Amino acid sequence: MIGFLKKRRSIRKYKDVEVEKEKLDKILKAALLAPSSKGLRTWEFIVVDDKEKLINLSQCRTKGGGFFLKNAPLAIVIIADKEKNDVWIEDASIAASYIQLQAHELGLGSCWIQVRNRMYDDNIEADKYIREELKVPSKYSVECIISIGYSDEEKKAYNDSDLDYKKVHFNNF
Amino acid sequence: MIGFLKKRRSIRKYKDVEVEKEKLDKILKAALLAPSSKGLRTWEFIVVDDKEKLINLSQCRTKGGGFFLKNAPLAIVIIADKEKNDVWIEDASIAASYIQLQAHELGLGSCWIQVRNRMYDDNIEADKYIREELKVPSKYSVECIISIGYSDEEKKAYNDSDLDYKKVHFNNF
Numbered sequence: 522m523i524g525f526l527k528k529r530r531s532i533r534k535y536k537d538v539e540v541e542k543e544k545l546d547k548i549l550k551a552a553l554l555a556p557s558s559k560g561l562r563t564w565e566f567i568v569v570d571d572k573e574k575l576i577n578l579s580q581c582r583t584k585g586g587g588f589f590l591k592n593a594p595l596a597i598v599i600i601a602d603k604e605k606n607d608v609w610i611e612d613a614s615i616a617a618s619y620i621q622l623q624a625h626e627l628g629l630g631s632c633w634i635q636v637r638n639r640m641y642d643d644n645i646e647a648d649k650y651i652r653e654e655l656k657v658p659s660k661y662s663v664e665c666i667i668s669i670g671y672s673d674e675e676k677k678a679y680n681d682s683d684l685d686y687k688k689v690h691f692n693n694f
Numbered sequence: 695m696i697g698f699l700k701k702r703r704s705i706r707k708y709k710d711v712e713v714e715k716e717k718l719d720k721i722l723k724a725a726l727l728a729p730s731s732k733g734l735r736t737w738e739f740i741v742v743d744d745k746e747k748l749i750n751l752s753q754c755r756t757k758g759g760g761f762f763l764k765n766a767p768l769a770i771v772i773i774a775d776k777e778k779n780d781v782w783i784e785d786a787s788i789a790a791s792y793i794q795l796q797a798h799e800l801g802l803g804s805c806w807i808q809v810r811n812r813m814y815d816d817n818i819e820a821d822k823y824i825r826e827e828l829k830v831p832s833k834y835s836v837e838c839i840i841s842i843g844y845s846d847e848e849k850k851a852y853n854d855s856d857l858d859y860k861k862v863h864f865n866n867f
């Protein structure tokens with residue numbers, strides 16, 4: 522598990538290879554098993570493998586952040602029913618991380634694209650642009666997009682020298 | 695891994711047994727390996743095993759939420775430097791999920807205690823109460839407490855049938 526996590530690096534460049542149905546199905550199962558506040562499961566997942574839609578979504582932040590989505594084979598857009606609970610950010614973040622870890626176990630690379638609190642441009646929220654592109658009703662907000670694919674880039678694993686132990690406090694700050 | 699996650703259930707009743715140092719250490723290593731926005735690692739961790747501190751912290755929401763913490767052998771309070779990034783909520787949430795998963799792999803139970811957006815009572819934020827209790831400077835915000843220990847209650851594992859496929863959308867909402 523520690524070694525599993527040391528090998529998890531964010532991947533932004535992917536082989537031209539589709540994510541198999543069998544793998545996508547396990548990733549979704551992991552997402553649906555995420556602990557949520559009050560067990561309410563505020564999240565919903567939009568699976569995107571249509572190439573033109575992925576191109577559209579890669580522009581969700583015109584000043585950058587998700588451009589590499591254009592050449593990913595798969596994305597899961599994580600949204601949340603913000604009316605149902607006010608810790609939907611937590612809920613969606615936990616599901617996101619489960620998606621990414623399950624993908625890592627299946628030999629896939631992934632990257633989180635931040636949407637919440639990000640601008641599409643000076644006039645429009647990234648949340649708004651994604652809801653238009655995916656026909657999402659206004660009661661939902663978009664937390665993030667996780668792009669998923671077979672890695673086409675080299676990244677080093679973390680090791681124990683990367684661990685910032687100064688960030689651990691005992692019984693008080 | 696899906697089997698791993700199906701057996702992960704929140705635990706709020708614990709054996710009267712310390713969490714041994716070798717397991718604490720692996721839990722902290724998983725937390726320190728968590729992906730963060732811009733690699734900024736806005737979070738910090740306060741390990742609490744002092745019984746009196748645990749009692750104090752179990753009162754952080756006087757109307758309920760973390761009362762069981764008084765009977766836990768261990769807690770990790772996840773705080774974040776909220777001036778470092780605005781998505782410290784996400785950062786902290788991912789680290790807390792890594793903590794809970796590594797606790798699970800080591801045969802321990804755990805439970806998330808929500809702090810952000812929660813009140814100590816009608817006048818005081820739970821965040822502010824905890825920062826006073828743990829002497830946390832004001833630039834930090836408290837995300838949640840993870841109580842950790844050996845489980846003293848039985849919990850049914852999740853089923854394939856428990857999964858919410860209504861929450862999966864393909865190519866559009």
Ligand SMILES: Cc1cc2nc3c(=O)[nH]c(=O)nc-3n(C[C@H](O)[C@H](O)[C@H](O)COP(=O)(O)O)c2cc1C
Nearest residue numbers: 556557558559560611612702703704759806807808
């Ligand atoms: C964001 C978040 C906040 C939570 N806050 C609390 C809490 O304050 N008190 C508590 O007893 N459980 C809390 N939980 C645990 C949930 O009750 C639990 O994860 C959910 O009911 C699913 O049940 P399970 O974890 O046993 O599978 C929280 C969970 C999440 C994801």
Ligand SMILES: Cc1cc2nc3c(=O)[nH]c(=O)nc-3n(C[C@H](O)[C@H](O)[C@H](O)COP(=O)(O)O)c2cc1C
Nearest residue numbers: 530531586633634635729730731732733781784785
């Ligand atoms: C909350 C969060 C938001 C992120 N948003 C983006 C993003 O918008 N664009 C991007 O390219 N990477 C994003 N990342 C990945 C980060 O750049 C970060 O460096 C990475 O998670 C840490 O490096 P690593 O995953 O390779 O270990 C995000 C990560 C987190 C935790």
